[PDB]
Symmetry: D3
Subunit: 294 residues, 6 copies
C-alpha cells in the first residue's frame, strides 16, 4: 500500500545526512541551470536578432528589444554570478553558510560582459564568414546562422570564455556543456580561439582547457585537441597556428605540440609532436584485407 | 545608480547592428521560424507514427479527427514557412531589399509544394515501415518494433531526413537543413538533406555518422556509429560515395569520394578507411593492428 | 504570357479552394493505417508515454541530487516535503507506466488482442522496489561523483561535476534504467537510456552491468553493449566502443577494476577480458584479452609529410 | 530570521492536526471529488461545439469542422464521464454514510458514460434552442449591433448557454456539476440561475447583473428580464418560485415572489415593482409615482 | 465510443440547419483573446508599475512602451481590419469569397495609429479620474490602493479605451471591451456613452449606463445605479450635468431627463423627469411595519 | 458610411516610422502625470503574487476542493509543508514591499531584515492562525447548509457557493488588516468582489456562522460590525448615511436575517439580536431584539395593455 511511502521518504531524507556530497541543502542558493540557460538565450538574441525567437525585429523596434534584454541580463547575470562567487569563496575557505561585497563584484563583471557584446558580434561575424568560406556547398549566411551547429557551439563558447577570463566559477562550464549537449561539440571554456574559426559537422570534437588556436582555423567532426595519456593553467593541450585545417577524426595531443601555420592534418591522423608550417600530414595508405563472402 | 550606463551599452549594441549587418535580419520581412519548423516536424511525426508520440488515446474511431486537424493546420503553417523561405531566397538572389507593404509573393507556389508534401505522407509511411523492419532485422537484440519506434535514434534521424529530403527535392530553401540539423542535434546523426537513401535503411547507435549531400545509398543498407560517407580532402556534382544494396558498414569506417562505389552485399569492417570502389560480395577489414604492450 | 520575375505565379496568394483536397489527403492517410499497421498503435491500449517517462526521470533526479536541479531553495527543514511529494507522485506514475509496458509486452508475447494477470499490482511491486533502493543508488552515485573529481584533475569542484558533467548525467539515467531492467520492465529502460543518449551522445544499453566509481570523461560517441560488465573504478573517454564482434549470451567485453580506456578505443567480444589496472590507449582496437597491469598503445603511426602547395 | 523559518514545520503540523479535528471543510482520502478546473474546461469545449468561430479557434470552416467537433466530442466523452462518475460515487457514499475505505461495488463509470452520451446527443437540439435565444436578444435590444456582437459578448446569452447545459445535467440527476456550472456563469456575469429552473425558448436577459432565478421557477417562451430582477421565494412561508407565462417583460429591479404567483401572458412588470400575487394576462404593473422630497443644496 | 461518430455527424448537420450561431468559413472574425491581450497591453501603457511588470523605472520604461506600441500597431491593425471587413460584409449581405483579402487593412491601420496617438491624452483624462476617486472616497488609503484595485477605476479605464474605438466607428471590439470590464466589475457601461472628466464610480456592482447617456464632469455614482431608458417609449438615456452625485440604487430614466448641475439623487430614488440644478432629491421615509417575533 | 479611398490597400509599413515618436510622447506623459505610475527601483506588491498567495491559502483551508484531488492523510503533510514554506517567502516579500512603500509615502522619503523582519513576523502570525481560521470557516460552511434548506451538501457549498468564497477571502484579508498591512487586504477583498459581486471592506468585523446567499450587490462598510449566525441576501447594503476609523456603518447582532435588497445605514444603527429585516426595507436607526421589520404592502398601478 501507499502506507509504505512515508517510510521510503524518511529513508531518502536520512540518506541526505549520510551522503552529503551530492546535495546542496541549506540557505545558500547555488546558481540555477535554468537561469543560466535563459541568460544564454537572451545573449544569443542580442547577438543574432532576427534568427532566434523573435521574427518581427526591425530598425524601428530593435532598441526596445535590446534595451529590455540588457536591463534584465544586468539583474539576472549579477544574481547568478554573485551566487557562483559566494559559493566558491565559502568552499575554498571551508566557511559554512551561517549591491555590496560579492554582489558588487558580480555586477562589475556583468557590466564588463555586456560592454563587450559589440566586439563579440565583430568576432562572430568573422566566424560566420569562415563557415561560408569553409563550406563551398553552403546555401547562404542565413542557413549557416540558422542551423550550423559549429557556429552555435562557438557562440556559446565565446560567451563562456569571457566569463572564464573574469574568474566566474561554475557558469562557464555550465554554458559550454549546454552547447556540448546540443551539438556534440565539447569545448572547454578556458580554450583560447582566434577569429574566423569554423567547425564543420562537429560531432565528437573535443578541445581542452589550455588549447590555443589562432585565426582562420577549420576543424571537422571527431577532432580531438587533447592531453597526452602519460606524464590556461599548466599547458597540456596543443597550439594550432593560423590557417590550419584538421580533417575528420584526427587527434592532436600534448602541451608542447605545435601545428604550424598553414598546415593540413589529414583525416584519421594521430599526432603527439609538432608539425612545421606549410606541411600536409596524411595517414599511410591503409593495408586492407579483402575476402569474398561465400 | 550603475544601471544608468545600460542605455549607453544598449546604444553601442544597436550601432554594431549597422556596422555588422551580416549576422542579423532586421526588417519587415520575417524569415522562417526555427520553432515553427520544429512544430511542423512534430505534427508530421504525429501523422507518421500515431500512438507513439504525444497522444496515446488514438483508435480507428477518432484518428480521422486527429489527422484531419493536423493536415489542415500543416497546410497553413507549411505554406507560411515555405513562402518566407522562397521570398528570402528570391530577395537574396536579386540583391533586393524589403518592400514597404506586406508581400504575399510565393504563397501559391509555397502552397503547391506543401500539398505535394502532404500527398506523399502515405508513401512515406510505406518507406518508413520498411525502415522500422530493417531496424528489427538489423538488431537481433531489439525488444520489439514498439521499442524501435519509441526510442531508436537511427529511426528518428531517418524519419526527419526523409521529410527534409522531399522538401529538398521541391527546392525549398533553408527548411530542409533546419530539419536535418535539428535531428543532428537530437541524435548525433548528421545526414545532409540532399542525400539519396533507399528503403529498409538502418543506422544502429548512430552518434557521429555523417552522410554528404551527394551520397547515394540503395536498399537494405545498415550503418553503425561514427561512419563517414564523405568527400576527399584533396583529389550536385558528385563528391560523396555510392552504396549499393545490402551493404553493411561497421563502426567508425570512412568511405570517401564521388567515384567510390561500394558494391552489392559488400561488408566494410570497423575502422576501415577507403577511397576506392569495392566489388560486390567483398568483405573489407583492417589489417590486424600492431599494438604495444608494457608492464605498468 | 509574360511575367515580371522568374517563376510564373509568384504574385498569387494561397488558393483557399485547394483546401477542399485536404479531406481526401486525410482519408488516404487513414487508409494507409489499415495497410501498414506496424508503425502505429491505434486501439484502446495506451502504450507508455515518452513524456511521462521523461517526467519520471526528472523527479528521480530531483530526489537523487536535490539542490542541483529545478528547485534551489531546499534545506533540511523543507526537503521532506519535496521528497515526500515526489515519492507519492512517482508511485502513481511509475505504476501506471510500468503496468502499460507489462500489459503490452504480455499481449505481444502471446497472440492476445486488445479487445489477464493483475498487471497493476505487479507494476506497483516493481515501483516500490525501485523507490526502496534510491538511498542505495545515492551511495553509488556519490562514489561516481568522487570518481569524476579524481579522474579529472582540472575539475573545479564536486558542484561543477554534478551541475554539468555529461558523463555523470548519462550514468545516473543508466543506473535508474538498469534497476528497471533487472525488474524485467519492458520498453522503459531503453526509453531512459536513449533519452540520455540523445542529451550526451553517450549510449549505454540498460542491460550493462557497471560497478561503483565509474567515470566517463567527455563521452560523446561512447557505446556500451547489453552484456558488457564493468567493475569498479573504471574510467572511459569519448568515442570508446565496448561492443560485439562483427564476425542472454555474452557478446560484449568484461572490464576489470581500475581500468582506463582512452579516446576512440574499441574493445569487442564476449570473451574479451580487460584485466585489473590495464590501460587501453587512444585509438587502440582489440578483440582479445589483456592481462592485469598492461598498458596497450598503438604503434607510432606511419605518416606521410609533404609541402602544402 | 532564518532561525524563525525553523517554526514552519510546526505550523505545518498544526494545520495537518486541524484536519483531524475539523473534517468538514476538507476531502482527504483516496476518492477524488470532481475538479472545478475540469468542469470549467468541459464547459469551454461544450461552448466551442455550440458556437464555433466565436470562441477559441478562428480558422474553422466546413472542411475542417468535422475534425474539430469529432475531437471535442471524443475528449468530452472521457472527461464528462470521469467528472460525472466522481460526483455520483461521492454522492452515493455521502447519502449512505459508506465512506471511502469501504469499496463502492457500484458501476458509476458506466452510468456516468450513459449520462454523458445523453448530453452529447442533445447538443443539436440545444443549438436549436440557443439560436432562438440569440434572436430574442437581437429582437429585445433595439440598439443591438448584430447577432455576432450578441454571441461574442452579451452576458445574458453566456449565462443562459451555461444554464441550459447545467439544466440538462440537472434533469439527469448529476450531483454537484450543474451548480458548479451555474455558479461559474454567476461569477462571470452577476446572473444567478439555479440549474433546476425551467426556461422556455427565446429567453433574453438584458444587462443582467443582479438577476436571481430560483430552482422551481418556470418561465415560458419569449420572456425578457433586466438587471436586478429576482424571481424568488417568500420570506415567511415543492414549488416555491413564480411561473412566468409567454411574452412577459420584467424591467430592472423588479421582485416576483412565491410558488403560487403566476404572471400572465404578455404582462409587463415595471421597474422596481415588487409582487407576491398573480397578475392576469395583458396587464401592465407599475409602481405608484413615488413621493420624492426636493430641497435646495447648501 | 462507437456512438460518437454519429453524434459528431448530427452536430455538423445542425451547423447547416442553424447557421446564425456559427461563423464557419475562410474569414476569421476578431478574436476575443487577442482583444483581451490588446487591452492588457494598453493597460500596461496607461498605468506602468501597477500591472504585470514591477521592475519598470525611467531608465527602461521606453523599451517597455516602445515594444508594446510596436506590437499593438500590428495586432490592433489585424483585429480592427477583421471587425471592419466582417461588419461591412454583414451589413451589405456580401459573403466571404475564397481569396485572402487586404480589405479595410489600410483603414484599420489608420484607426490604430489614431488610437495610439491619443494615449497621452487618455493618461491625462485618467489622472483626473484617479483624483476623483481619491476626492470621492474620503476613507481611501492612498492613490496606490485606488489604482491597484478600485473596480470603478478599472471599468472607467476600459470604457474610455472602448469609447475612442467607438468614435472611430470600429465594430464589435468596443462592446467586447466594455462587456469584459462588466464581467470583472459588475459595472455595465455602453461604449457609446459620453462621460466627461473626473468621473468616479464607488463600489459599482449593478451600475448600468446606456448608449445615449451623457455625463458631464465631476460626477460620482454608487452601486446599483441605473441610467437607462423608459419602459414605454436617438436619445433614450439621461443627461447628468457637472458635479452630480447619484447614491446607491437610484434609477434615472428617459432621453429627456436632465439632472442639473450640483444636484444630489438620494439612495433608491427613482426619477423619469428632469431635476433643476442645486436640488437634493430624496425618497419619502418608508412606511415600515414592526412586530415582535414569536 | 462612405469607405474612404485607399482603405483597401495593405498596411503601409513606413507608417511604423511614426511609432518611436508616439512612444516618446507616452514616456513624456509619465513625467507630466506622475500620480498614475510607479516608476523606479522600489517595486510595489504584485497583484498576481497576491492572487497566488490567496490560491495557496485556499488550498490549505479547503484541501480536496481546489487544485489537487489526490490528497490523503499520507501525503497532505508534504502538500501543506511546501505551501507554508513558499507562503512564508512570498507573503514576507509582498508585505515588506507594502510596508516600505507606505512608510516612504507617509514620510517624504524617496527611493534612494528591517521592514523584512517586520513583514516576516506578520507572515508567521498569519500562518499560525490558519487552524483557527479553518475552525471559523467550518462554521460558515455549516451556516450556509443551515441557511439554505435546498442546499445539496456541504460539498456543493464549498465547491461553488459565492458567499463562502467571498467570506473566506475577507477573513484572510481581515487578519492582514488587523496586522496593519497596507494595500494587500483591499487587493484581496476587491479580487473577491470581482469574482462574486460581494463587496466587503477588509476592516469589517464579522463573527462566526456568517452566510451570504446569492450575494451579488452586497456591500459591507469598513466599520460595520456583524455578530454570530447572521444571514444576508443579494443586494443588501450595510452602509453610511449620505448626510452625516470613527464608526459610520451599522452593528448587526446575533441571528439577524436581512432579506434581499434591504438597506441598513448609520454608525449608531444597531439591529438587535434575532431581528428580521424584510426584503427592500430601508432603515437608518436601531431596532431592538426580536423585531420583524417589513415594508408596507406596495401601492401598485394596473392598466390594460394597449
Ligand atoms: Cl552531412
Ligand atoms: Cl440572454
Ligand atoms: Cl457594456
Amino acid at each position: 500500500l501507499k502506507d509504505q511511502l512515508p517510510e521510503i521518504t524518511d529513508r531518502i531524507v536520512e540518506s541526505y545526512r549520510d551522503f552529503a556530497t551530492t546535495h546542496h541543502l541549506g540557505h545558500c542558493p547555488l546558481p540555477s541551470s535554468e537561469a543560466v540557460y535563459e541568460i544564454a538565450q537572451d545573449l544569443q538574441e542580442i547577438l543574432f536578432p532576427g534568427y532566434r525567437r523573435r521574427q518581427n525585429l526591425h530598425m524601428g523596434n530593435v532598441t526596445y528589444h535590446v534595451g529590455d534584454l540588457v536591463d534584465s541580463l544586468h539583474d539576472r547575470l549579477t544574481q547568478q554570478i554573485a551566487r557562483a562567487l559566494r559559493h566558491d569563496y565559502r568552499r575554498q575557505h571551508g566557511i559554512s553558510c551561517a549591491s555590496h561585497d560579492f554582489e558588487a563584484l558580480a555586477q562589475a563583471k556583468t557590466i564588463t560582459l555586456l560592454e563587450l557584446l559589440p566586439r563579440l558580434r565583430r568576432t562572430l561575424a568573422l566566424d560566420v564568414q569562415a563557415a561560408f568560406d569553409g563550406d563551398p556547398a553552403a546555401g547562404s549566411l542565413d542557413e549557416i546562422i540558422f542551423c550550423y551547429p559549429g557556429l552555435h557551439a562557438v557562440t556559446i563558447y565565446r560567451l563562456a570564455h569571457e566569463l572564464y577570463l573574469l574568474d566566474v566559477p561554475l557558469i562557464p562550464r555550465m554554458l559550454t556543456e549546454w552547447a556540448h549537449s546540443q551539438t556534440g561539440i565539447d569545448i572547454h571554456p578556458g580554450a583560447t580561439i582566434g577569429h574566423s574559426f569554423f567547425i564543420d559537422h562537429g560531432t565528437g570534437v573535443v578541445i581542452g582547457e589550455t588549447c590555443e588556436i589562432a585565426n582562420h582555423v577549420k576543424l571537422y567532426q571527431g577532432v580531438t585537441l587533447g592531453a597526452l595519456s602519460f606524464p590556461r593553467r599548466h599547458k597540456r593541450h596543443p597550439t594550432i597556428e593560423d590557417h590550419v585545417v584538421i580533417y575528420a577524426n584526427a587527434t592532436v595531443l600534448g602541451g608542447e605540440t605545435v601545428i604550424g601555420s598553414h598546415a593540413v592534418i589529414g583525416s584519421s591522423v594521430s599526432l603527439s609532436h609538432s608539425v612545421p608550417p606549410n606541411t600536409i600530414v596524411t595517414i599511410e595508405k591503409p593495408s586492407l584485407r579483402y575476402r569474398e563472402a561465400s
